Structures are given as C-alpha cells and as structure tokens.
Design a protein around this ligand. Sequence first.
Ligand SMILES: [Mg+2]
Ligand SMILES: [Mg+2]
Ligand SMILES: [Mg+2]
Ligand SMILES: [Mg+2]
Ligand SMILES: [Mg+2]
Ligand SMILES: [Mg+2]
Ligand SMILES: [Mg+2]
Ligand SMILES: [Mg+2]
Ligand SMILES: [Mg+2]
Ligand SMILES: [Mg+2]
Ligand SMILES: [Mg+2]
Ligand SMILES: [Mg+2]
Ligand SMILES: [Mg+2]
Ligand SMILES: [Mg+2]
Ligand SMILES: [Mg+2]
Ligand SMILES: [Mg+2]
Ligand SMILES: [Mg+2]
Ligand SMILES: [Mg+2]
Ligand SMILES: [Mg+2]
Ligand SMILES: [Mg+2]
Ligand SMILES: [Mg+2]
Ligand SMILES: [Mg+2]
Ligand SMILES: [Mg+2]
Ligand SMILES: [Mg+2]
Ligand SMILES: [Mg+2]
Ligand SMILES: [Mg+2]
Ligand SMILES: [Mg+2]
Ligand SMILES: [Mg+2]
Ligand SMILES: [Mg+2]
Ligand SMILES: [Mg+2]
Ligand SMILES: [Mg+2]
Ligand SMILES: [Mg+2]
Ligand SMILES: [Mg+2]
Ligand SMILES: [Mg+2]
Ligand SMILES: [Mg+2]
Ligand SMILES: [Mg+2]
Ligand SMILES: [Mg+2]
Ligand SMILES: [Mg+2]
Ligand SMILES: [Mg+2]
Ligand SMILES: [Mg+2]
Ligand SMILES: [Mg+2]
Ligand SMILES: [Mg+2]
Ligand SMILES: [Mg+2]
Lengths: 101, 70, 87, 116
Amino acid sequence: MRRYEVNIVLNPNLDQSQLALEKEIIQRALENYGARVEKVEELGLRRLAYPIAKDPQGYFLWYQVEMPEDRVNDLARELRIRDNVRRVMVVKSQEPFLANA
Amino acid sequence: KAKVKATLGEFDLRDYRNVEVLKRFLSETGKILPRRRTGLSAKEQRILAKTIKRARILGLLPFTEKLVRK
Amino acid sequence: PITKEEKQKVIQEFARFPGDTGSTEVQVALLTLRINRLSEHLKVHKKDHHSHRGLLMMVGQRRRLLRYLQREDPERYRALIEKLGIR
Amino acid sequence: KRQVASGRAYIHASYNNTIVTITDPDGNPITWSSGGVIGYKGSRKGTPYAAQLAALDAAKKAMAYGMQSVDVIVRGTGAGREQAIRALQASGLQVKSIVDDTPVPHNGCRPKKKFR
RNA sequence: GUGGGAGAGGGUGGUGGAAUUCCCGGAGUAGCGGUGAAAUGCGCAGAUACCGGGAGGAACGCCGAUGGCGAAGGCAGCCACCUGGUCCACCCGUGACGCUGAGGCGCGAAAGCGUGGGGAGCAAACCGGAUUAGAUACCCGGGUAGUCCACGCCCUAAACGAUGCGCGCUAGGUCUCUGGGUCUCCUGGGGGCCGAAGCUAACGCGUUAAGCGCGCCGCCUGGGGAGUACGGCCGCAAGGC
Ligand SMILES: [Mg+2]
Ligand SMILES: [Mg+2]
Ligand SMILES: [Mg+2]
Ligand SMILES: [Mg+2]
Ligand SMILES: [Mg+2]
Ligand SMILES: [Mg+2]
Ligand SMILES: [Mg+2]
Ligand SMILES: [Mg+2]
Ligand SMILES: [Mg+2]
Ligand SMILES: [Mg+2]
Ligand SMILES: [Mg+2]
Ligand SMILES: [Mg+2]
Ligand SMILES: [Mg+2]
Ligand SMILES: [Mg+2]
Ligand SMILES: [Mg+2]
Ligand SMILES: [Mg+2]
Ligand SMILES: [Mg+2]
Ligand SMILES: [Mg+2]
Ligand SMILES: [Mg+2]
Ligand SMILES: [Mg+2]
Ligand SMILES: [Mg+2]
Ligand SMILES: [Mg+2]
Ligand SMILES: [Mg+2]
Ligand SMILES: [Mg+2]
Ligand SMILES: [Mg+2]
Ligand SMILES: [Mg+2]
Ligand SMILES: [Mg+2]
Ligand SMILES: [Mg+2]
Ligand SMILES: [Mg+2]
Ligand SMILES: [Mg+2]
Ligand SMILES: [Mg+2]
Ligand SMILES: [Mg+2]
Ligand SMILES: [Mg+2]
Ligand SMILES: [Mg+2]
Ligand SMILES: [Mg+2]
Ligand SMILES: [Mg+2]
Ligand SMILES: [Mg+2]
Ligand SMILES: [Mg+2]
Ligand SMILES: [Mg+2]
Ligand SMILES: [Mg+2]
Ligand SMILES: [Mg+2]
Ligand SMILES: [Mg+2]
Ligand SMILES: [Mg+2]
C-alpha cells in the first residue's frame, strides 16, 4: 500500500440528493478497490481557470489514501466512469518540500 | 523589476492544490516564468514546473490567457 | 518491487552467521532473487530492452561470484545451488 | 437595420493580407473588410496602407450599423498589424480594449518546409 | 549492507490543453490564398475572417539552459504502475571475488521490406502555376507511398568528442548540475571554459589529456582502379559484412 491523494472534481450544478449520491458512490468505489481513507479535504466551488465541460467552475474534493499500489490504476478507471465526475487525478504522496521556507 | 520568491511567504513548492500562491509564478499569458524572474534554483524550478502542470490539469491554473494593451 | 523486510528475510536465510550482510552467499542469493523478479517482468514487457541490459549485467555478476565460491569452498557452492535452484 | 453600438473588432494580419471584422459582443460578425476589399490586388494588400484603409472601411460600415464603442482582438503579426490598430484608433470609433490573441500551438503540427 | 538523493534511462496502461484539418450550426459578403511580382488553386452550391458544437490523427509551447539521464542509437505534456543504471554518507559485511575481451549473443537513428491497422499536418514519386535562354531543379498550388501503432525482418550513418574500455600519477582559475559537511568555504560525483608541466606537424590537448605510465581488445601501412570484381556468409527484397 502507498499513500495517495485522489482528486475529484465534479459539475457544481447538482442538488443535494445528487451530490450526496455521487459522493457516496465514490466512497464505495474507494472502499471496494482496497483503499483506506486517511484525510478528506472538500473545498467545493472554485471558479476554474479555463472551461471544463462547458462549465466556468468546479466542485472539488481531495482524499488522502493508502491503497494497494497494484489497484490504483483500476480504481482510477472506476472513479472516472461516472458521467458527472468531471476530472479525476490520483497522485502519490510526496512530503512537503518548501523553498524560500 | 524584482523577483518572485523574494516577496512571497515560506511555502509549499509541491502544492498542486494551492493556487493563491502558484498564480504568482505565471505570465499575463499562461506562461511559467523563467528563472531570471522567479528567483528560483534549478531544482526549485523543476518542482515548480511540475506542480504548475498538475495544477493546470485540475483546472486551477490556465494553459493560456491573453495579452492586454499591445 | 524488492522491499526492506522482503530483502531482510533473504539476508536471514543466507547469512553464514549472525549479522553478515556481505558474504558470497548473501550476495549471490540476494542478487539471484533480484534477477528472478527482473526476468519475470521481462517475460512481459518483452519490448523493454534497457532493463534487459541490466539483467545481463546482473547475471554476469552472479556467475562471477558463483565461480569464485566454486573455486574456494565447493561444498558451500553446491550448498548455494541446492538452495537456489541454479546452474 | 441592426442596432448594435458596442462590440468586438478582430484585426487579423498576415504577411500577405490584412483583414478586419466587426462583430456583436457575442461574436456573430457584422461587417468586415480586407485588403482586396478596398482596392488593392497583389502583394499590395499586405502593406500597412491597406491595413489602414481596411480598418477604416470596416469601421465606417459599423457606423452605418450604429456602432460606437469597440474592444479589439488582434490575431497575427505582419506589416501593419499596428496600422489597423492606429486606424481603428482615430477611426471615430472609440476603442474600449486592445488584446492580443494570436493562437500558437502548444507544438502539434508539422509545418510546411518554408516554415522550418 | 544500511540510510539518503537527482534525472526527458526503459516498458505498459490512462489522461490534458493549444493548434491544424474536416463535419454540423449561427451570423456575414467578395474575395481568399500566395509571390520578388505573379499564376495555378479555392470562392455566389456562400469561401475567407468571427462565434458555438462535433470527429479524428499527430505532436507536446512556456518551464528549457551554454541543463539532465543513457553503454550506444537515442530520451521532453501530466498521472499511475512495472523496471534498469548511477551518486553520496556511515566504514557495517565478504576477502582479490579483479581488468580486457577474438568468437558468440543482444541492442542499434533514419530510410527501406512483410502482414495487418491507422491516416489530421507534412510529403519522395507524381500532376499542375509564373521565373522567363530554360525546368522539366530552386518559388507557388495539389498529391501517393511514407511519416503514426502492433508483430516480424533490414544492421547501415558525419552511429562524431571524426578521440576503444580500466587504473595510477602530474599547477590552478572560473561558470555550472547533483550529494555530504561543522555551509568566508571544504569534500565526492557529472557538464563546460581558460590555462602549470608536458605533449603536438601545426591547429590544438592540458585531473572530462591528445601529458606521464601499465594491461587488454580493434585498426593502419601512397593515389587512381575500388568498397569495384570474384568467392563465401547473412537477407523476402533493397542490400549488408
Ligand atoms: Mg497578398
Ligand atoms: Mg541504498
Ligand atoms: Mg523518463
Ligand atoms: Mg517513460
Ligand atoms: Mg459555416
Ligand atoms: Mg478572380
Ligand atoms: Mg470556378
Ligand atoms: Mg465549382
Ligand atoms: Mg471551430
Ligand atoms: Mg477521418
Ligand atoms: Mg527554448
Ligand atoms: Mg548524437
Ligand atoms: Mg530506480
Ligand atoms: Mg571493515
Ligand atoms: Mg575479516
Ligand atoms: Mg567487459
Ligand atoms: Mg577480429
Ligand atoms: Mg563482441
Ligand atoms: Mg534500424
Ligand atoms: Mg523507421
Ligand atoms: Mg519500394
Ligand atoms: Mg510497413
Ligand atoms: Mg500499411
Ligand atoms: Mg510541394
Ligand atoms: Mg517554367
Ligand atoms: Mg499541401
Ligand atoms: Mg558531433
Ligand atoms: Mg566510438
Ligand atoms: Mg574544472
Ligand atoms: Mg557541492
Ligand atoms: Mg549543501
Ligand atoms: Mg568538477
Ligand atoms: Mg584549453
Ligand atoms: Mg607550454
Ligand atoms: Mg597555439
Ligand atoms: Mg587518462
Ligand atoms: Mg595525440
Ligand atoms: Mg595501388
Ligand atoms: Mg557497400
Ligand atoms: Mg576470388
Ligand atoms: Mg558477392
Ligand atoms: Mg539466398
Ligand atoms: Mg546502398
């Protein structure tokens, strides 16, 4: 297992049944692919820099995980399958290098 | 005509999530600034590139903007 | 990929006495393990040559130490092989 | 008959011709002009002069449609890119903003031999 | 061995934006393109320039360097996985286990061959346009193989530092990449520039030798004829040695 940050951005426009729901599905995918959860930072609406799926903005969340480094790739493909997940980026954890620090 | 890391806090260079800081390293045009103006170091620089490009993908920073006046 | 206590369990198994991290046994094993993983990934990813260069060098090193051990104590050499499934 | 009065002016210059386009603020164009439009024919079209008479022609047509205040987008480089600008200046339209949009690829396409 | 690094080293999957082309839609006319100037070409079946949407291939701007990695060929979006090399510190383990390497076996840019895909841009061949002694070569417009991917061949090159690999020794200075230290600096590996001694026909090289030495491999012995012929070997061929 290694430590990762899964990044998910969604289309903002959702009602709460819809948002809670896609978040839940994400949860069950994470749970299913072997991923432990450690932290969650859900930042919500940020105005994007350039349009993504015709939307000026996105609904962000971030998930620190530790999961079998075999399965990261598939857990990514399954995260992405849902239509209303606009972008998904999984990254390995690096420690916090700081300069001019 | 001064340098970036000069006036700026003491900060994560590995942060793809943190725009409020990273924007400061880009041109009016979407461009990443050369060392000559970021005041960085060769390694510092490389990490700044990668963290921008990641950030860019996430829609947090621009791949390009447009030049004003001219 | 080879990790800490994966590697340790091998050093345990082959150390000719407590704490020996360095002997012909330990190297030839540790190495042979390393080869085996490699030739394993190179059974897929046939098309990756640069690693295969690596493995040529790796095997070369093994047969070097091996030849050495064989020269010095034959009993221990047979020993190493009867463990490792080689030559 | 239109009613526009505020909108975009896209100057597009090349080393060969120069072409202006005036357009409603959602970008559906309104009138336009170019080097061959006003008199010129050959090489002549990529002079700065033409760039002027062009930028001008297009403006006096926007006047005809009702135009006044206009935000400019410049695309291209070339002889008299600045001429269409400076023409649009004292054109009688007053220029809200000047932006440079010349698209560059992020390196994708093989260019033809005269270009490498 | 333990602990740390840096990196376009390699393989596989996935994904991002710009641009080009094309398709649909809106607005909108009379040209656009292109050159030294032209013409072919495209355009009233509505082009160009402009906005929105879609399809698809290929390449990755800025960062980028006079930088990094690799044994060489070579390697630049981002992520993940799968791997190779290599540097440093600690001075822990083994105890000469070393160097080179005919033959072998592997790798080997591009172009080229085979069979399948793919095909946006470019583009040998080719089809056209003005230059104007004249293209039919330089310029302009089309354009097929090919460039892209999978598997399999080909094995060449200015494959270049025109400088075989290892090791020991012989002033410094300066810029730099990456480690360690008690961090006006010093110490270890890389990359550059001047330059002791020395070398060199000269040019130049000079702790990244072309200096001083030892080991080992490859190679050389006027020019034309000729990388030809003959013979073998390899190859589907082209052709290679
Ligand atoms: Mg012209
Ligand atoms: Mg280590
Ligand atoms: Mg790489
Ligand atoms: Mg790679
Ligand atoms: Mg249309
Ligand atoms: Mg005509
Ligand atoms: Mg016609
Ligand atoms: Mg027709
Ligand atoms: Mg479009
Ligand atoms: Mg098509
Ligand atoms: Mg550059
Ligand atoms: Mg080269
Ligand atoms: Mg590694
Ligand atoms: Mg000792
Ligand atoms: Mg001893
Ligand atoms: Mg050797
Ligand atoms: Mg021989
Ligand atoms: Mg050989
Ligand atoms: Mg080849
Ligand atoms: Mg090829
Ligand atoms: Mg042929
Ligand atoms: Mg083929
Ligand atoms: Mg084919
Ligand atoms: Mg042509
Ligand atoms: Mg002619
Ligand atoms: Mg063409
Ligand atoms: Mg060279
Ligand atoms: Mg050589
Ligand atoms: Mg030096
Ligand atoms: Mg240092
Ligand atoms: Mg330091
Ligand atoms: Mg040095
Ligand atoms: Mg010198
Ligand atoms: Mg001298
Ligand atoms: Mg001299
Ligand atoms: Mg030497
Ligand atoms: Mg010499
Ligand atoms: Mg002779
Ligand atoms: Mg020949
Ligand atoms: Mg004969
Ligand atoms: Mg023959
Ligand atoms: Mg035959
Ligand atoms: Mg030939």
